[PDB]
Coordinates of C-alpha atoms and ligand atoms in Angstrom, one line a residue:
Chain A
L1 CA 164.8 -106.7 -94.8
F2 CA 166.9 -104.0 -96.2
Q3 CA 170.7 -103.8 -97.0
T4 CA 172.7 -103.5 -93.9
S5 CA 176.2 -104.5 -95.3
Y6 CA 178.1 -102.0 -97.7
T7 CA 181.6 -101.0 -99.0
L8 CA 182.8 -97.3 -99.1
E9 CA 184.7 -96.6 -102.3
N10 CA 186.6 -93.6 -104.0
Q11 CA 187.6 -92.0 -100.6
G12 CA 184.1 -91.9 -99.1
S13 CA 182.1 -90.6 -102.2
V14 CA 180.8 -93.8 -103.5
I15 CA 178.7 -96.4 -101.8
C16 CA 178.7 -100.0 -103.4
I17 CA 176.1 -102.7 -102.3
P18 CA 175.3 -106.2 -103.4
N19 CA 172.8 -106.5 -106.3
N20 CA 170.6 -108.8 -104.4
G21 CA 167.5 -107.0 -104.9
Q22 CA 167.2 -105.2 -101.5
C23 CA 166.8 -101.5 -100.8
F24 CA 169.8 -99.7 -99.2
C25 CA 169.8 -96.3 -96.9
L26 CA 172.4 -95.1 -94.3
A27 CA 169.4 -93.3 -92.4
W28 CA 167.8 -96.6 -91.7
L29 CA 171.0 -97.7 -90.2
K30 CA 170.9 -95.2 -87.2
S31 CA 170.5 -96.5 -83.8
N32 CA 167.2 -96.7 -82.0
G33 CA 168.5 -96.3 -78.7
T34 CA 170.5 -97.8 -75.8
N35 CA 170.2 -101.3 -74.6
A36 CA 169.0 -100.0 -71.3
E37 CA 166.1 -98.4 -73.2
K38 CA 165.5 -101.4 -75.2
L39 CA 165.1 -103.6 -72.0
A40 CA 163.0 -100.7 -70.3
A41 CA 160.6 -100.9 -73.3
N42 CA 160.4 -104.7 -73.4
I43 CA 159.5 -104.5 -69.5
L44 CA 156.7 -102.1 -70.1
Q45 CA 155.3 -104.2 -72.9
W46 CA 154.6 -107.2 -70.8
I47 CA 153.3 -104.9 -68.0
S48 CA 150.8 -103.6 -70.4
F49 CA 150.1 -107.1 -72.0
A50 CA 149.5 -108.5 -68.6
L51 CA 147.0 -105.7 -67.7
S52 CA 145.3 -106.0 -71.0
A53 CA 145.2 -110.2 -70.4
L54 CA 144.1 -109.2 -67.0
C55 CA 141.4 -106.9 -68.2
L56 CA 140.0 -109.2 -70.9
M57 CA 139.9 -111.9 -68.2
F58 CA 138.0 -109.4 -65.5
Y59 CA 135.8 -107.8 -68.5
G60 CA 134.5 -111.3 -69.3
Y61 CA 133.0 -111.8 -66.2
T62 CA 124.6 -102.7 -70.7
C63 CA 127.5 -104.3 -72.7
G64 CA 131.0 -102.8 -72.3
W65 CA 131.7 -103.7 -75.8
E66 CA 134.0 -100.5 -75.9
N67 CA 136.5 -101.8 -73.3
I68 CA 136.6 -105.2 -74.9
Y69 CA 137.5 -104.0 -78.1
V70 CA 140.4 -101.7 -77.4
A71 CA 141.7 -104.6 -75.2
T72 CA 141.2 -107.3 -77.8
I73 CA 143.4 -104.8 -80.1
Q74 CA 145.9 -104.1 -77.6
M75 CA 146.9 -107.5 -76.7
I76 CA 146.8 -108.5 -80.6
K77 CA 149.1 -105.5 -81.0
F78 CA 151.5 -106.8 -78.3
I79 CA 151.7 -110.2 -80.5
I80 CA 152.6 -108.1 -83.3
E81 CA 154.9 -106.0 -81.3
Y82 CA 156.7 -109.0 -79.7
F83 CA 157.9 -110.6 -83.0
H84 CA 158.2 -107.6 -85.3
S85 CA 158.7 -104.7 -83.2
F86 CA 161.0 -103.2 -86.0
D87 CA 160.1 -104.9 -89.1
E88 CA 158.3 -103.6 -92.2
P89 CA 155.6 -102.3 -92.1
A90 CA 155.5 -102.4 -88.2
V91 CA 158.1 -99.7 -88.8
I92 CA 158.0 -97.9 -92.0
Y93 CA 161.5 -97.3 -93.7
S94 CA 160.7 -94.7 -96.1
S95 CA 162.6 -93.4 -99.0
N96 CA 163.4 -90.0 -97.4
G97 CA 165.3 -91.6 -94.6
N98 CA 162.2 -91.5 -92.2
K99 CA 161.2 -94.3 -89.7
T100 CA 157.5 -94.0 -89.0
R101 CA 156.0 -96.4 -86.4
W102 CA 152.9 -97.4 -88.4
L103 CA 152.1 -100.2 -85.6
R104 CA 151.5 -97.2 -83.2
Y105 CA 149.5 -95.2 -85.6
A106 CA 147.5 -98.0 -86.6
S107 CA 146.5 -98.9 -83.1
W108 CA 145.3 -95.3 -82.4
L109 CA 143.1 -95.4 -85.5
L110 CA 141.6 -98.7 -84.0
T111 CA 141.3 -97.4 -80.4
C112 CA 141.1 -93.8 -80.1
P113 CA 137.7 -93.4 -81.6
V114 CA 136.5 -96.2 -79.6
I115 CA 137.5 -94.4 -76.6
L116 CA 135.5 -91.3 -77.6
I117 CA 132.3 -93.4 -78.3
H118 CA 132.7 -94.4 -74.6
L119 CA 133.3 -91.1 -73.4
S120 CA 130.1 -90.1 -75.5
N121 CA 128.0 -92.5 -73.4
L122 CA 129.8 -92.5 -70.0
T123 CA 126.5 -93.6 -68.1
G124 CA 126.0 -96.4 -70.7
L125 CA 122.3 -95.8 -70.8
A126 CA 121.3 -97.2 -73.9
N127 CA 121.1 -94.6 -77.1
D128 CA 122.4 -91.3 -75.4
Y129 CA 125.2 -89.7 -77.3
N130 CA 124.7 -86.3 -79.0
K131 CA 125.4 -84.8 -82.3
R132 CA 128.8 -83.5 -81.0
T133 CA 130.0 -87.0 -80.9
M134 CA 130.4 -87.4 -84.8
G135 CA 132.4 -83.9 -84.4
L136 CA 134.6 -85.7 -81.7
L137 CA 135.1 -88.7 -84.0
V138 CA 135.8 -86.9 -87.3
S139 CA 138.3 -84.4 -85.7
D140 CA 140.4 -87.1 -84.0
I141 CA 140.6 -89.3 -87.0
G142 CA 142.1 -86.3 -88.6
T143 CA 144.4 -85.9 -85.9
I144 CA 146.0 -89.0 -86.3
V145 CA 146.0 -88.6 -90.0
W146 CA 147.7 -85.4 -89.9
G147 CA 150.2 -86.9 -87.3
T148 CA 151.0 -89.9 -89.4
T149 CA 151.5 -87.8 -92.4
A150 CA 153.7 -85.4 -90.2
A151 CA 155.9 -88.4 -88.9
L152 CA 156.1 -89.4 -92.5
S153 CA 157.0 -86.2 -93.9
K154 CA 160.4 -84.0 -93.1
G155 CA 161.0 -80.3 -92.7
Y156 CA 158.1 -77.7 -93.4
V157 CA 155.7 -80.3 -94.7
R158 CA 156.0 -82.0 -91.5
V159 CA 155.3 -78.5 -89.3
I160 CA 152.3 -78.1 -91.7
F161 CA 150.5 -81.4 -91.0
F162 CA 151.7 -81.3 -87.5
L163 CA 149.9 -77.8 -86.9
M164 CA 146.9 -79.4 -88.9
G165 CA 146.8 -82.3 -86.5
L166 CA 147.2 -79.8 -83.7
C167 CA 144.2 -77.8 -84.8
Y168 CA 142.1 -81.0 -84.9
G169 CA 143.4 -82.0 -81.5
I170 CA 142.3 -78.5 -80.1
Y171 CA 138.6 -79.2 -81.4
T172 CA 138.9 -82.6 -79.9
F173 CA 139.6 -81.6 -76.4
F174 CA 137.1 -78.6 -76.1
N175 CA 134.3 -80.8 -77.3
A176 CA 135.7 -83.7 -75.1
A177 CA 135.7 -81.2 -71.9
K178 CA 132.1 -80.2 -72.7
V179 CA 131.3 -84.0 -72.6
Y180 CA 132.9 -84.5 -69.3
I181 CA 131.0 -81.3 -67.8
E182 CA 127.8 -82.6 -68.7
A183 CA 128.6 -86.3 -67.8
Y184 CA 129.9 -84.6 -64.2
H185 CA 126.3 -82.9 -63.5
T186 CA 124.4 -86.2 -65.0
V187 CA 125.8 -88.9 -62.8
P188 CA 124.8 -89.2 -59.0
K189 CA 126.3 -86.7 -56.4
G190 CA 128.1 -89.8 -54.6
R191 CA 131.2 -91.6 -55.8
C192 CA 130.2 -91.5 -59.3
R193 CA 131.1 -87.9 -59.7
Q194 CA 134.7 -88.9 -58.2
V195 CA 135.6 -91.2 -60.9
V196 CA 134.2 -88.8 -63.6
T197 CA 136.6 -86.3 -62.6
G198 CA 139.4 -88.9 -62.4
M199 CA 138.7 -90.2 -66.0
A200 CA 138.8 -86.5 -67.3
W201 CA 142.2 -86.1 -65.4
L202 CA 143.7 -89.4 -66.9
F203 CA 142.3 -88.2 -70.4
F204 CA 143.6 -84.9 -70.9
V205 CA 147.1 -85.6 -69.1
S206 CA 147.7 -88.8 -71.2
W207 CA 146.1 -87.5 -74.4
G208 CA 148.2 -84.3 -73.9
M209 CA 151.5 -86.0 -73.8
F210 CA 151.1 -87.5 -77.1
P211 CA 151.9 -84.1 -78.8
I212 CA 154.5 -83.7 -76.2
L213 CA 156.3 -87.1 -77.2
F214 CA 156.0 -86.1 -81.0
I215 CA 158.1 -83.1 -80.5
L216 CA 160.6 -84.8 -78.2
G217 CA 161.2 -88.0 -80.2
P218 CA 162.8 -88.5 -83.7
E219 CA 159.8 -87.1 -85.4
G220 CA 160.6 -83.8 -83.8
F221 CA 163.8 -82.5 -82.3
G222 CA 165.4 -86.1 -81.2
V223 CA 165.8 -85.4 -77.6
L224 CA 164.3 -89.1 -76.9
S225 CA 165.4 -92.2 -78.9
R226 CA 163.3 -94.5 -80.6
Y227 CA 163.6 -96.8 -77.8
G228 CA 162.9 -94.0 -75.5
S229 CA 160.0 -92.8 -77.3
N230 CA 158.4 -96.1 -77.3
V231 CA 158.7 -96.3 -73.4
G232 CA 156.8 -92.9 -73.0
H233 CA 154.1 -94.1 -75.4
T234 CA 153.6 -97.3 -73.4
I235 CA 153.0 -95.4 -70.2
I236 CA 150.4 -93.0 -71.6
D237 CA 148.8 -96.0 -73.3
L238 CA 148.7 -97.8 -70.2
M239 CA 146.9 -94.8 -68.7
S240 CA 144.7 -93.7 -71.5
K241 CA 143.4 -97.2 -72.6
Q242 CA 143.7 -99.7 -69.7
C243 CA 143.2 -97.4 -66.8
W244 CA 140.6 -95.3 -68.5
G245 CA 138.5 -98.3 -69.4
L246 CA 138.9 -99.7 -65.9
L247 CA 137.4 -96.5 -64.5
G248 CA 134.7 -96.2 -67.2
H249 CA 133.8 -99.7 -66.4
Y250 CA 133.8 -98.9 -62.7
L251 CA 131.4 -95.8 -63.5
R252 CA 129.1 -97.8 -65.5
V253 CA 128.8 -100.3 -62.5
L254 CA 127.9 -97.8 -60.1
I255 CA 125.3 -96.3 -62.4
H256 CA 123.7 -99.6 -62.9
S257 CA 123.3 -100.3 -59.3
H258 CA 121.9 -96.9 -58.8
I259 CA 119.4 -97.5 -61.4
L260 CA 118.4 -100.6 -59.8
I261 CA 118.2 -99.5 -56.1
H262 CA 116.8 -96.1 -56.5
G263 CA 115.3 -96.3 -60.1
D264 CA 115.9 -93.9 -63.2
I265 CA 115.0 -90.6 -61.5
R266 CA 115.6 -87.3 -63.4
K267 CA 116.1 -83.8 -61.8
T268 CA 116.5 -81.0 -64.6
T269 CA 119.5 -78.9 -63.7
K270 CA 120.5 -75.6 -65.7
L271 CA 124.1 -75.3 -67.0
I272 CA 122.2 -76.6 -71.7
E273 CA 120.1 -78.8 -69.4
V274 CA 120.8 -82.0 -67.8
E275 CA 118.7 -84.7 -66.6
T276 CA 120.7 -85.6 -63.1
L277 CA 120.3 -89.0 -61.5
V278 CA 118.9 -88.7 -58.1
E279 CA 117.8 -91.2 -55.3
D280 CA 114.3 -90.0 -54.2
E281 CA 111.3 -88.7 -56.2
Chain B
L1 CA 163.9 -87.8 -103.4
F2 CA 165.7 -91.1 -103.9
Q3 CA 168.6 -92.4 -105.9
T4 CA 167.7 -93.0 -109.4
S5 CA 171.1 -93.1 -111.0
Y6 CA 173.6 -95.9 -110.3
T7 CA 176.4 -98.2 -112.0
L8 CA 176.4 -101.9 -112.2
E9 CA 179.8 -103.4 -111.5
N10 CA 181.4 -107.0 -111.2
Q11 CA 179.2 -108.3 -114.0
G12 CA 176.0 -107.4 -112.6
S13 CA 176.6 -108.7 -108.9
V14 CA 177.4 -105.2 -107.3
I15 CA 175.5 -101.9 -107.5
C16 CA 177.3 -98.5 -106.9
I17 CA 175.5 -95.3 -105.9
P18 CA 176.7 -91.8 -105.0
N19 CA 177.3 -91.4 -101.2
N20 CA 174.9 -88.4 -101.4
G21 CA 172.9 -89.5 -98.4
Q22 CA 169.9 -90.3 -100.6
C23 CA 168.2 -93.8 -100.4
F24 CA 168.4 -96.5 -103.1
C25 CA 166.4 -99.2 -104.4
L26 CA 165.7 -101.0 -107.9
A27 CA 161.9 -101.8 -107.2
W28 CA 161.1 -98.0 -106.8
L29 CA 162.5 -97.2 -110.3
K30 CA 159.8 -99.6 -111.8
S31 CA 157.3 -97.9 -114.1
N32 CA 154.1 -96.5 -112.9
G33 CA 152.4 -97.1 -116.3
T34 CA 151.9 -95.8 -119.8
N35 CA 151.9 -92.2 -120.9
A36 CA 148.2 -92.5 -122.1
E37 CA 147.2 -93.8 -118.6
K38 CA 149.2 -90.9 -117.1
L39 CA 147.1 -88.4 -119.2
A40 CA 144.0 -90.3 -118.7
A41 CA 144.6 -89.9 -115.0
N42 CA 145.3 -86.3 -115.0
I43 CA 142.2 -85.8 -117.2
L44 CA 139.9 -87.4 -114.4
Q45 CA 141.8 -85.4 -111.9
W46 CA 140.3 -82.2 -113.1
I47 CA 136.8 -83.6 -113.8
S48 CA 136.4 -84.6 -110.1
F49 CA 138.0 -81.4 -109.1
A50 CA 135.8 -79.1 -111.2
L51 CA 133.0 -81.3 -109.7
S52 CA 134.1 -80.8 -106.1
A53 CA 134.5 -77.2 -106.9
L54 CA 131.0 -76.6 -108.4
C55 CA 129.7 -78.7 -105.6
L56 CA 131.3 -76.2 -102.9
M57 CA 129.9 -73.5 -104.9
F58 CA 126.4 -75.3 -105.0
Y59 CA 126.4 -76.4 -101.6
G60 CA 127.3 -72.9 -100.1
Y61 CA 123.7 -71.7 -101.3
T62 CA 119.4 -78.6 -91.3
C63 CA 123.0 -78.3 -92.1
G64 CA 124.7 -80.6 -94.7
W65 CA 127.9 -80.5 -93.1
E66 CA 128.8 -84.0 -94.2
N67 CA 128.9 -82.7 -97.9
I68 CA 130.9 -79.8 -97.1
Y69 CA 133.6 -81.8 -95.2
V70 CA 134.3 -84.5 -97.8
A71 CA 134.2 -81.7 -100.6
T72 CA 136.7 -79.6 -98.6
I73 CA 138.9 -82.7 -98.2
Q74 CA 138.5 -83.6 -101.7
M75 CA 139.6 -80.3 -103.4
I76 CA 142.7 -80.0 -101.0
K77 CA 143.5 -83.5 -101.9
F78 CA 143.7 -82.3 -105.6
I79 CA 145.9 -79.6 -104.5
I80 CA 148.2 -82.1 -102.9
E81 CA 147.9 -84.4 -105.8
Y82 CA 148.4 -81.8 -108.5
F83 CA 152.0 -80.9 -107.1
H84 CA 153.2 -84.3 -105.5
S85 CA 151.4 -86.9 -106.9
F86 CA 154.1 -89.4 -106.5
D87 CA 156.4 -87.9 -103.8
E88 CA 157.0 -88.7 -100.3
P89 CA 154.8 -89.2 -98.2
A90 CA 151.9 -88.8 -100.8
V91 CA 153.5 -92.4 -102.3
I92 CA 155.5 -94.3 -99.4
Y93 CA 158.5 -95.9 -101.1
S94 CA 159.0 -98.5 -98.2
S95 CA 162.1 -100.4 -97.8
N96 CA 160.6 -103.7 -98.8
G97 CA 160.4 -102.2 -102.4
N98 CA 156.6 -101.2 -102.0
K99 CA 154.8 -98.2 -103.4
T100 CA 151.7 -97.5 -101.2
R101 CA 149.6 -94.6 -102.0
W102 CA 149.0 -92.9 -98.6
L103 CA 147.4 -90.0 -100.1
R104 CA 144.6 -92.2 -101.1
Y105 CA 144.2 -94.1 -97.7
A106 CA 144.6 -91.1 -95.8
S107 CA 141.7 -89.5 -97.7
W108 CA 139.7 -92.5 -97.2
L109 CA 140.3 -92.2 -93.4
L110 CA 139.1 -88.6 -93.7
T111 CA 136.0 -89.1 -95.9
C112 CA 134.7 -92.5 -95.4
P113 CA 133.4 -92.2 -91.9
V114 CA 132.0 -89.0 -92.8
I115 CA 129.7 -90.5 -95.3
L116 CA 128.8 -93.4 -93.1
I117 CA 127.7 -90.6 -90.6
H118 CA 125.6 -89.0 -93.5
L119 CA 124.1 -92.6 -94.2
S120 CA 123.3 -92.9 -90.5
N121 CA 121.1 -89.7 -90.9
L122 CA 119.8 -89.8 -94.4
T123 CA 116.6 -87.8 -93.7
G124 CA 119.0 -85.2 -91.6
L125 CA 116.1 -84.9 -88.9
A126 CA 118.3 -83.6 -86.1
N127 CA 119.4 -86.3 -83.6
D128 CA 118.4 -89.4 -85.3
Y129 CA 121.2 -92.0 -85.7
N130 CA 121.4 -95.5 -83.7
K131 CA 123.6 -97.4 -81.8
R132 CA 124.7 -99.5 -85.0
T133 CA 126.2 -96.0 -86.3
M134 CA 129.4 -96.8 -83.9
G135 CA 129.4 -100.2 -85.5
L136 CA 129.5 -98.8 -88.9
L137 CA 132.3 -96.5 -87.9
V138 CA 134.4 -98.6 -85.8
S139 CA 134.3 -101.4 -88.8
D140 CA 135.0 -99.1 -91.5
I141 CA 138.2 -97.3 -90.0
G142 CA 139.5 -101.0 -89.3
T143 CA 138.6 -101.9 -93.2
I144 CA 141.1 -99.0 -94.1
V145 CA 143.5 -99.5 -91.5
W146 CA 143.9 -103.4 -92.4
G147 CA 143.9 -102.3 -96.1
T148 CA 146.6 -99.9 -95.6
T149 CA 148.7 -102.4 -93.6
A150 CA 148.1 -105.0 -96.4
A151 CA 149.2 -102.5 -99.1
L152 CA 152.6 -101.8 -97.0
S153 CA 153.1 -105.6 -96.5
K154 CA 154.0 -108.4 -98.8
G155 CA 153.4 -112.2 -99.3
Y156 CA 151.5 -113.9 -96.7
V157 CA 151.3 -110.8 -94.3
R158 CA 149.5 -108.8 -97.1
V159 CA 146.7 -111.5 -97.5
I160 CA 146.2 -111.7 -93.7
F161 CA 145.8 -107.9 -93.4
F162 CA 143.8 -108.2 -96.7
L163 CA 141.3 -110.8 -95.4
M164 CA 141.1 -109.0 -92.0
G165 CA 140.1 -105.9 -93.8
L166 CA 137.4 -107.8 -95.7
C167 CA 135.8 -109.3 -92.8
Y168 CA 135.5 -105.7 -91.5
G169 CA 134.2 -104.8 -94.9
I170 CA 131.6 -107.5 -94.5
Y171 CA 130.4 -106.2 -91.3
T172 CA 130.2 -102.6 -92.8
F173 CA 128.1 -103.5 -95.5
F174 CA 125.6 -105.5 -93.7
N175 CA 125.0 -103.0 -91.2
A176 CA 124.9 -100.5 -93.9
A177 CA 122.2 -102.5 -95.9
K178 CA 119.9 -102.5 -92.9
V179 CA 120.4 -98.7 -92.6
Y180 CA 119.4 -98.3 -96.1
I181 CA 116.4 -100.6 -95.6
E182 CA 115.1 -98.7 -92.6
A183 CA 115.7 -95.5 -94.6
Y184 CA 113.5 -96.7 -97.5
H185 CA 110.5 -97.5 -95.3
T186 CA 111.1 -94.2 -93.4
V187 CA 110.9 -91.6 -96.2
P188 CA 107.8 -90.6 -97.9
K189 CA 106.2 -92.9 -100.6
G190 CA 107.0 -90.5 -103.5
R191 CA 110.5 -89.5 -105.2
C192 CA 112.1 -90.0 -102.0
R193 CA 112.1 -93.7 -102.0
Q194 CA 113.6 -93.3 -105.5
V195 CA 117.0 -91.5 -104.7
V196 CA 117.2 -93.8 -101.5
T197 CA 117.2 -96.5 -103.7
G198 CA 119.7 -95.0 -106.0
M199 CA 122.0 -93.6 -103.1
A200 CA 122.4 -97.6 -102.3
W201 CA 123.3 -98.7 -105.7
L202 CA 126.2 -96.0 -105.9
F203 CA 127.0 -97.0 -102.6
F204 CA 127.5 -100.9 -102.8
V205 CA 128.8 -100.6 -106.4
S206 CA 131.3 -98.1 -105.8
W207 CA 132.3 -99.4 -102.2
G208 CA 132.5 -102.9 -103.8
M209 CA 135.0 -101.8 -106.5
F210 CA 137.7 -100.7 -104.1
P211 CA 138.6 -104.3 -102.7
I212 CA 138.1 -105.3 -106.4
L213 CA 140.9 -102.7 -107.4
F214 CA 143.1 -103.8 -104.7
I215 CA 143.3 -107.2 -106.0
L216 CA 143.9 -105.9 -109.8
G217 CA 146.4 -103.3 -108.9
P218 CA 150.2 -103.5 -108.1
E219 CA 149.0 -104.5 -104.2
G220 CA 147.6 -107.6 -105.8
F221 CA 148.3 -109.5 -109.0
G222 CA 149.5 -106.6 -111.2
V223 CA 146.8 -106.5 -113.8
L224 CA 146.6 -102.7 -113.5
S225 CA 149.5 -100.0 -113.6
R226 CA 149.9 -97.6 -110.9
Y227 CA 148.5 -95.2 -113.4
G228 CA 145.8 -97.6 -114.1
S229 CA 144.9 -98.1 -110.6
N230 CA 144.7 -94.3 -110.0
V231 CA 142.1 -94.0 -113.0
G232 CA 139.8 -96.7 -111.5
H233 CA 139.9 -95.3 -107.8
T234 CA 139.0 -91.7 -109.4
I235 CA 136.0 -92.9 -111.0
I236 CA 134.6 -94.6 -108.0
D237 CA 135.7 -91.7 -105.7
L238 CA 133.5 -89.5 -108.1
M239 CA 130.6 -91.8 -107.7
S240 CA 131.0 -92.6 -103.8
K241 CA 131.7 -89.2 -102.7
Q242 CA 130.5 -86.3 -105.2
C243 CA 127.5 -88.2 -106.5
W244 CA 126.5 -90.0 -103.4
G245 CA 126.8 -86.5 -101.6
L246 CA 124.6 -84.7 -104.4
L247 CA 121.9 -87.4 -103.9
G248 CA 122.0 -87.2 -100.2
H249 CA 121.5 -83.5 -100.5
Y250 CA 118.6 -83.8 -103.0
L251 CA 117.1 -86.2 -100.5
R252 CA 117.5 -83.9 -97.4
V253 CA 115.8 -81.1 -99.5
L254 CA 112.9 -83.2 -101.0
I255 CA 112.3 -84.2 -97.0
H256 CA 112.5 -80.6 -95.8
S257 CA 109.8 -79.6 -98.2
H258 CA 107.8 -82.4 -97.0
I259 CA 108.0 -81.5 -93.5
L260 CA 107.1 -77.8 -94.4
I261 CA 104.1 -78.6 -96.4
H262 CA 102.4 -81.7 -94.9
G263 CA 104.2 -81.4 -91.3
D264 CA 106.1 -84.3 -89.5
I265 CA 103.5 -87.0 -89.4
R266 CA 104.5 -90.4 -88.3
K267 CA 102.8 -93.7 -89.0
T268 CA 104.3 -96.6 -87.4
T269 CA 105.0 -99.7 -90.0
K270 CA 106.4 -103.0 -88.8
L271 CA 109.4 -104.7 -90.5
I272 CA 112.0 -103.4 -86.3
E273 CA 109.4 -100.7 -86.3
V274 CA 109.9 -97.5 -88.5
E275 CA 107.8 -94.0 -88.0
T276 CA 107.1 -93.3 -91.8
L277 CA 106.4 -89.7 -93.1
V278 CA 103.1 -89.3 -94.4
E279 CA 101.1 -86.5 -95.8
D280 CA 97.8 -86.6 -94.1
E281 CA 96.7 -87.2 -90.4
Ligands
RET1 C1 145.8 -94.6 -77.0 C2 146.6 -93.5 -77.8 C3 146.0 -92.3 -77.6 C4 144.6 -92.0 -76.9 C5 146.5 -91.2 -78.6 C6 146.1 -90.1 -78.6 C7 146.9 -89.2 -79.3 C8 146.8 -88.0 -79.8 C9 145.5 -87.2 -79.2 C10 147.7 -87.1 -80.7 C11 147.7 -85.9 -81.1 C12 148.5 -85.1 -81.8 C13 148.2 -83.8 -81.9 C14 146.9 -83.3 -81.4 C15 149.1 -82.8 -82.8 C16 149.3 -83.8 -84.3 C17 150.4 -85.0 -83.9 C18 149.9 -85.8 -82.6 C19 148.8 -86.3 -83.6 C20 150.4 -87.1 -82.2
RET2 C1 135.8 -92.7 -101.2 C2 136.4 -93.9 -100.9 C3 135.9 -95.1 -100.4 C4 134.4 -95.0 -100.0 C5 136.4 -96.3 -100.1 C6 136.0 -97.3 -99.7 C7 136.9 -98.6 -99.5 C8 136.5 -99.8 -99.3 C9 135.2 -99.8 -98.6 C10 137.7 -100.5 -99.1 C11 137.6 -102.2 -98.7 C12 138.8 -103.0 -98.4 C13 138.2 -104.1 -98.2 C14 136.8 -104.4 -97.5 C15 139.2 -105.4 -98.0 C16 140.7 -104.9 -97.5 C17 141.2 -103.9 -98.5 C18 140.1 -102.7 -99.2 C19 140.7 -102.1 -97.7 C20 140.7 -101.7 -99.6
OLA3 C1 140.2 -78.1 -87.4 C2 138.7 -77.8 -87.7 C3 137.7 -78.7 -87.2 C4 137.9 -80.5 -87.4 C5 136.6 -81.0 -86.7 C6 135.5 -81.0 -87.9 C7 134.4 -81.9 -87.7 C8 133.0 -81.4 -88.0 C9 131.9 -82.1 -87.4 C10 131.3 -81.2 -86.2 C11 129.9 -81.4 -86.4 O1 129.1 -81.1 -87.3 O2 129.3 -82.2 -85.2
OLA4 C1 135.3 -108.2 -88.3 C2 134.4 -108.1 -86.7 C3 133.8 -106.8 -86.2 C4 134.4 -105.5 -86.7 C5 133.4 -104.5 -86.3 C6 133.3 -104.3 -84.8 C7 132.7 -103.1 -84.3 C8 132.1 -103.1 -82.8 C9 130.8 -102.1 -82.7 C10 129.4 -102.8 -82.9 C11 128.7 -102.1 -81.8 O1 128.8 -102.5 -80.6 O2 127.8 -101.3 -82.1
CL5 CL1 160.2 -96.8 -84.1
CL6 CL1 150.5 -95.1 -106.5

C-alpha cells in the first residue's frame, strides 16, 4: 500500500519516512468513519449481494439481457469490494490528498448506460428505441465522467466539473421523463401503467440522490464519512439497479402475456403519437 | 502539486520531507521522456487542435451531430491539455507509484461511444441503427473501464483487467465488422463504397493501435516514454476521430445527393438481407 508509519522531527516541521519505495501522504491517513458505519456498510453489502444472487437465480428461469448484465457486474463488484474495499485502485489515493472511489464510478460506467437502454425499450418489443436513446447515453456517460473528474479534483476545478456533470444530468432526466411519459401511454391500461409509474419514481428518486450524496460526502462538504457515503450509495444502488430491474422484468412479463392473449393491437393516441396496446380490435 | 524536494538520511535508508501537507513519492519523480519527445508531442497537439478547429469551422457550414460532439470535446481537451498536461487529475499520481493519464481515458469515454453511434448509422438516414448497436456501446465502455482499471493497477491485477478489456475489445471489433459489411452492400455502387472501405481501414488500424500502445508504454513494458506514448496516441487519435469523422461526413454527403437525384430506391440483396440504394427503379 502506502506509508503509514512516520516520525515527526524538528518540532513538527519535518516528516521522516522509511526509504522503502512506498508513497506517503498525511491526508490518506484520515479516518474513513466510525466502526458502526463500517459494520452498517458491510451489512448492506451482503443484503445487496444476496439480492443480486437471488436475482441471477430468478432471472435464469424476448431476452432481458439488460437485467442479466448489471446483476453480473453487481455481484462481481461485491467480490472485488469484499476483499479490496479500500485498496488501490478500488480507492484512488491521488497526489492531491484525495480519496476517490473508482470502484463506484467504474460500476456506474458499466451499469448506468445499460439501465437507460432498458428504459429506451421498456416494453421489450424487438427493435423499438428512438433517436433520443443515443442522447440519453451520451449525456449519462458524460455525467459520470465529469463527476469522476470532479471527485478527483479539488477546489474550483471540482466545482466546474460538478456543474458540467450537473448539466449533463439535467439533459439526462428530461429526455428520460419523455421516455417514461410515452411508455405510460403505450403500455395497456391495466397493471402495466402502475409499474411504469413505479419505475419512474424509483428512477428519479434514486438517480436524484447521487448528486445529493456527492455534496454531503468527502467529495463535498463532509457531512458524511467515507463509510457513511458507502451506506447511502448502497441503498440507492439497491433501488436503482436491483429493484428497478425487477420491475422492468415484471413489466415485460405483463406485456408478453398481453401480446399472447389479446394479440398485438395498436390504437394511435395523440400526445407525438403513440401506438397503444389494446385488448380488442 | 506534490513534494519534489527531499533529503536522504541515515545512509540512504530514511527520507525526510517538509511537513507542508503535500504528498511524496519517489516514483512520481521519474522522467516523462526526452525534451525532443516533449516538443514532438507539443507539435502534434497544435496540429490536432488546428484540424479540430478547421473541422468545427467546416462542419458549421440530416444533422451530423456526432462529428460536432467529438470535435467540441477534442478542442476542449486541448485547452485542458495545453495548461495542465501533467497536473492532477489530468495525470493521476496514485499511491502505488502509478501515473495514469485520466485525461486520455476520460476523452475516450466521451468520444468513442459517439463514434460507434456514427458507425451504427453510416448512411445517416433517420432512425436506422440495430439491436447490435447497444452491444457495440456496452462492450466499448467496458473496454475503456477495464483499460483504465488496468492502467491504474499493477502486476497481475493489471493483467487481469487488461485481458478483460481485450475480450470486450474483441467483441467490439467483430460487431463493428458486421456493421461495416452491411454498410458496404447498402451504400450505392459508386464512390460511396470506396469511403466505406476507407473508413473501415482507418477504424481497425487506429483502434488496433491503442492496445498496442498500452503494451509499449509505461502501463506495459516501458519501451515508450510518457512523452513517447502521448505522441503515438495523438497520431491515432487524429486518425480515429478527425479523419474518420471527415470521411463519415463525406459519405453522408454523397448519400444525400444520391437520395435527391435518384430518389430513395431499394433493391433487396442477400448476405442477412440488405436494402441497397440504386439509381433506377
Ligand atoms: C446505479 C447507479 C446510478 C444509477 C448512478 C447515477 C448517478 C448519477 C445520475 C450521478 C449524477 C451526478 C450529477 C448529475 C452531477 C455531477 C456528479 C454526480 C455525477 C455524481
Ligand atoms: C479516439 C480513441 C479511441 C477510438 C480509442 C480506442 C481504444 C481502444 C479500442 C482500446 C482498447 C484496449 C483494449 C481492447 C484492451 C484493454 C486496454 C485497451 C483498453 C486500451
Ligand atoms: C449538457 C449538454 C448536452 C449533453 C448531451 C449531448 C448529447 C447529444 C446527443 C443528442 C442527440 O443528437 O440525440
Ligand atoms: C466480453 C463479453 C461481452 C461484452 C459485451 C456484452 C454486451 C451485451 C449486449 C449485447 C446485446 O444484447 O445486444
Ligand atoms: Cl471511499
Ligand atoms: Cl502521462
